[PDB]
Design a protein around this ligand. Structure first.
Ligand code: MG
Ligand code: MG
Ligand code: NA
Ligand code: NA
Ligand code: NA
Ligand code: NA
Ligand code: NA
Ligand code: NA
Lengths: 173, 173, 173, 173, 173, 173
């Protein structure tokens, strides 16, 4: 039953990796939802749409990198349903950015727990994988989203549609 | 409630489009599952893996094009859960190709039903969209998969691991 | 007696590093043996030979990088005899790949123990050195060797000399 | 009061980061002092001067990278006075190199303590930041300075002004 | 005790030069503080941050040019502590620009006093050094900062976060 | 038992070739030891280190060329342990060069005996192999090492660390 390549790879780590794959695919789908919300004719913030579509594709890449890890270590990928996002309508550029920030922080929390599990199972390969490819990426993503939220709020989002328009143009464009 | 852009776009067409978006995302996820099955150390058919990863990404693009259509016509996208694929283990290159063929034919059946609905609702824009971007793509995809299945079977797949190896190399490589 | 550069570098870490240098040189010599086995006129698998010669040279590089580490930290290199490989005759491409996989897993086990020692001695520099340069390299090497072994077996190695011939051509060539 | 981006970032880590920023700025100022000592008409070792000016600028960059970290994690930078170096007159190329070595080892000790704190607070992001950007840099810097000191001493520094002249020319030039 | 190069270089001029070096290093550190204030996630004015980081680096260059002067004339550099800036929190883009203007005017006042001292000691070399490298630079810097402050105020800074956002984009970006 | 390619290749020649392979691998390991001795922080002669690392790699190439010969003639390679060098500490650049000269002369002596054996067994192919690839190489290597030793001694090595420094720079650099 054991993969010929498997070495120092705990079943709990394999299970946590599968959970993280699902979480990354969920995040990708959330960002997809936000992108096409901004593509609506009654929202019409093209650069918000592009920003979130980019984020969605990046999240898919993260999921695929975790799947690659799973196979590299000799674990077995078990996919689950990708839950629909909590929203169909994201209300505003600012609200979408706030939801993105919350999502990224939740993903980061899951990564930190994954790292803690790896550490407890003395899996330095897994630990350094997470550190190299995920943790810093998360920190950057959270910082960027915080900057966006701060700027939008200072500009007067979401009540100033001029605010969101000009943010779309000058920051995301 | 009606989008300012909406014209000659039936609610039933909007609903069918949402169903098709979900189906395309499902197909993408199925192909993703197959790709990383072939990336397993105990399967190790890299070009099968690449082929299915490519198919997964193409399916995601098809879904995004349908979402774009939905917004273009003034419909509203409603996302649903993306169901996990029926399999974790696809057994063989031949079996995966057969499942892909079955999937593509099911998607094609759904597209033909969508076209029938569009025709009944006298929506020539939607009909042409499906014809131009989806129907011929499906016919080509089905023909290619049928060619793959035929070749694999003639070569002696799935019992001839040499068969699958050489197919991976010479057709998909 | 203490090197002017030495800082947070435990004697046990220095000793384990010397052991790892010897192990890397041993692995290099093993791969050299396999390469020239495949260069024999009665084996004549040129791309197997090239593959293992490449592996031998890579192993020498790994050993030299550990020696560089030892000097960087102010430890002192103590070289030992490089034991001859367990085999003169590696029997087949498949058998050689299986022995390579076993060797790489043993080296990986030694690296993991080295990491554990570093961790226990609170030597984060050493830990991240191992993580960055060795652990992922090992995981990749093991995965590749597992793929090779899987493919060879599925093709019918080692009884199908056609199998090994075609693997030599299409994968390693 | 808590930054919107802050996650898994302990107050003690923030405080230690501020201490490290100050230490890096101090080191930069020390190297600046040494550079312009070697620019004196009665010392006149241009390549020593360039070497230490380079080191000063590198130290400033390290400090700025720590400040960037602090903001990335949502901590708040608190700057302190940058203490003047212990010397105005560094006496010789050899003495300056020895003081630089001592300084670099002290900075390294502070980095190791920072890492230990990060580890204790289970901050893998901070740990890998230190490992990636600082620890190896320190090891290299210490090794280089040790090489310089060794060479100078063997050449006959600081009593052989010919020694320092030729070292300036051939190593640092 | 007298440098072999020293000629027409008064001790009071040497002392005033050392004071100016310290002042330039202080200004550099102030600008550094402002830069990373604007890099905070709750401020998030990237082009303000870049502007002040640039100013900090320029101030470092000014200090180094004065140190070079000191050595050229045969005076001896005596470094002092670099005092921390008066603020950790610069409150707004406008407030930071106003503080920068005040700082630049104080540095200019110190340069004018240095020039007056040079004149009184009949040190035309020192006088023309100050005139060529510093005085016009100061006049330009003050004019630019005044323009920034004027623009920000007219735009409605600091109460209009839109004001600061758009200034960051269009003037400093 | 006899290789299909074997012709005019005496068992004694095959045995002597295996001995020479081991000797070449030993010499490569000796040179490796010397290289990293010169990489020590308390020796710090980078160009000595590079010179000996180059020699080590060349020796490995010589060994591989002999292994290739063995297979070309239809003999069978039998590897032995590679003995550790007689020294961990090579004391000085001059001492290392003297040991290298002694080593090269011993290898040359072994090559001459190999040639004599070939001649006695009327193996002109083997004779001309040795003549073409090894004997002249040895003569050149010995002459170069003698030049190095002569220069070092005349410069005042090993007591003049300035001597070794400047030799490292001007001859080996
Ligand atoms: Mg790490
Ligand atoms: Mg004038
Ligand atoms: Na992610
Ligand atoms: Na499709
Ligand atoms: Na290795
Ligand atoms: Na530093
Ligand atoms: Na200035
Ligand atoms: Na040789």
């Amino acid at each position: 039953s054991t993969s010929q390549v498997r070495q120092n790879y705990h079943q709990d780590s394999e299970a946590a990796i599968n959970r993280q794959i699902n979480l990354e695919l969920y995040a990708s789908y959330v960002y997809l939802s936000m992108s096409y919300y901004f593509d609506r004719d009654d929202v019409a913030l093209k650069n918000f749409a592009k920003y979130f579509l980019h984020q969605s594709h990046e999240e898919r890449e993260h999921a695929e990198k975790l799947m690659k890890l799973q196979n590299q270590r000799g674990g077995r990928i078990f996919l689950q349903d990708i839950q629909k996002p909590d929203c169909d309508d994201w209300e505003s550029g600012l609200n979408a950015m706030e939801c993105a920030l919350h999502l990224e922080k939740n993903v980061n929390q899951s990564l930190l727990e994954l790292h803690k599990l790896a550490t407890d199972k003395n899996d330095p390969h897994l630990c350094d994988f997470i550190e190299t490819h995920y943790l810093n990426e998360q920190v950057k993503a959270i910082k960027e989203l915080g900057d966006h939220v701060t700027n939008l709020r200072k500009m007067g989002a979401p009540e100033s549609g001029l605010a969101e328009y000009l943010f779309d143009k000058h920051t995301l464009g």
